Amino acid sequence: KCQLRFASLGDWGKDTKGQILNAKYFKQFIKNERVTFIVSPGSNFIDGVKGLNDPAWKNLYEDVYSEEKGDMYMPFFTVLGTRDWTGNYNAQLLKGQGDATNYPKWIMPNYWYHYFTHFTVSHKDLAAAFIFIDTWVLSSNFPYKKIHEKAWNDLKSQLSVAKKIADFIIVVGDQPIYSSGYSRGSSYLAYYLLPLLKDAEVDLYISGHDNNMEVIEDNDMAHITCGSGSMSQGKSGMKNSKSLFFSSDIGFCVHELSNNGIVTKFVSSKKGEVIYTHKLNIKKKKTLDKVNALQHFAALPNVELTDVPSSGPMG
Ligand SMILES: [Co+2]
Ligand SMILES: [Co+2]
C-alpha cells in the first residue's frame, strides 16, 4: 500500500455516553480506512488512574476499544496530559513499557519519546517522524528542573534529526499552542516550543486538552486539536483568525500520509460523518540528507523511562 494511515483520539478516558458512541465509529473507521496505528493527544484518563490494577484500565480502555478478529490490535502511542499527572502517572508509564489482545497495545516508553517509520510510494520511500511530548514536563510548573531541561534538549535533538531524514514530521502532545477552545492556547509554548517546530518545518502539531476539534493553519504548519474523545465543551468565544474549522462534537481524526501530503479527516460521532477534510501539501525540503540517515539516527536521544518520584525534588 502506497500510504500510511493513523488515527488520533484525545482525552478519551471517561465513562460517558459520548465515549461509547465515539468508540463505535472509531472502530468502524479504523477497519474501513485500514488504519495501522493510533496516536493519543491530550490526556488519557480524565480522572487519572490510581495504579496498575485500577479497574479503570479495564472499564475505560480495554472494554471500550476492544474488537474480535484482532481488528483493534495495533499500537496506541500515547502521552500524558494534565489530568493524568494528578493521579498515578508512573503506573501509566509502567504499562507503557510492557501474546496479542483484543484492544490496542499501550505504548508509552517514556513521558516523551519518538517513533520513526517509513512507507513505499510510486519504488520510492517516504519517512515519517512522530515526536511525542509531555507539555506539562516542558512547562514552568514542573518541579524537577533537570528533567524539564532534559525533555527540552531531547526534543531539540529529535527535531534536529527529523530535519535531516523525515519527509513528514508530526508532533503529538496535550496542551495546544493555538486554540479557539477553552484554554485559548499557550503563549508559553508559542514562545518556546513553536520556534523549534517552525525551524524543523514540522507539518502537524496534534494536541488535545481543549474538548473540541479544530484546525488552525499558519506558515505551512497545521495545529490540530483532537480533544473530544469523550467530552464536548462548546464553541467558546471568538475564533482564532487562522482557524479553518472548529467543532465541539465528540469525535476523532483519521490522517493519511501519501506522496502528495497529509489528508486529515475530522469525524463526528453524531452520525459518523466526516465533517471536515484538511489537506496539507508535502514540503519540498533542502535540509534532507537521507544518504547518511544512519548517522543521523545515531544522534537521537536514548528512550529511557524516567523515574519521577512523587515526593518532589530534595537538595
Ligand atoms: Co525552562
Ligand atoms: Co488547561
Side-chain angles (χ1 to χ4, degrees), residues 70-104:
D71 289 346
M72 288 290 283
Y73 186 59
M74 61 185 69
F76 187 90
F77 295 106
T78 192
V79 293
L80 265 30
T82 56
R83 304 299 295 196
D84 300 298
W85 278 104
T86 59
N88 195 332
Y89 52 87
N90 186 247
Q92 298 199 43
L93 180 71
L94 291 172
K95 283 259 181 179
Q97 322 295 302
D99 43 318
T101 50
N102 297 328
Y103 47 79

Side-chain angles (χ1 to χ4, degrees), residues 11 31 40 45 53 61 63-64 82 95 122 134 138 156 226 250 258 284 287 298:
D11 298 280
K31 179 70 172 183
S40 182
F45 295 90
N53 299 298
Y61 178 80
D63 288 352
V64 175
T82 56
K95 283 259 181 179
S122 301
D134 190 303
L138 293 181
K156 290 172 178 175
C226 188
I250 287 169
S258 72
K284 297 181 72 178
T287 187

Side-chain angles (χ1 to χ4, degrees), residues 120 139 155 164 266 313:
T120 310
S139 82
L155 214 210
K164 297 286 206 174
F266 291 83

